[PDB]
Amino acid sequence: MNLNATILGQAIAFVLFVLFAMKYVWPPLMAAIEKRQKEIADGLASAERAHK
Amino acid sequence: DLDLAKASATDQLKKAKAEAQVIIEQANKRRSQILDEAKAEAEQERTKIVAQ
Prior knowledge:
Strand content of chain A: under 5%
Largest sheet of chain A: none
Largest interface: A-B, 4 and 4 residues
Number of strands of chain A: 0
Distance between the termini of chain A: 74 Å
Shape of chain A: rod-shaped
Helix content of chain A: over 70%
Oligomer: part of a larger assembly
Order of helices and strands of chain A: HH
Number of helices of chain A: 2
Radius of gyration of chain A: 23 Å
Structural class of chain A: mainly alpha
């Protein structure tokens, strides 16, 4: 079919989109989930210490 | 609930301290009673002996 220089342009485009997601998108996301988990587990700890 | 646990715990500890104070005070009262009654009893029996 039409194997084209488009394939190489799109390889560079693939790695560029990977880089954009790698630098800007993904790094800022991790913290929220851990904070929300922490504020639920500490309550179970508090109940245990009340009983103790 | 943990706040309630701490409050009741402090109340109970202070109550135990007050009970300890009262109990040891009665111990001291008993000691004074025993000492002075022993002195009086000794004198009573001695006076009886010389009368005899």
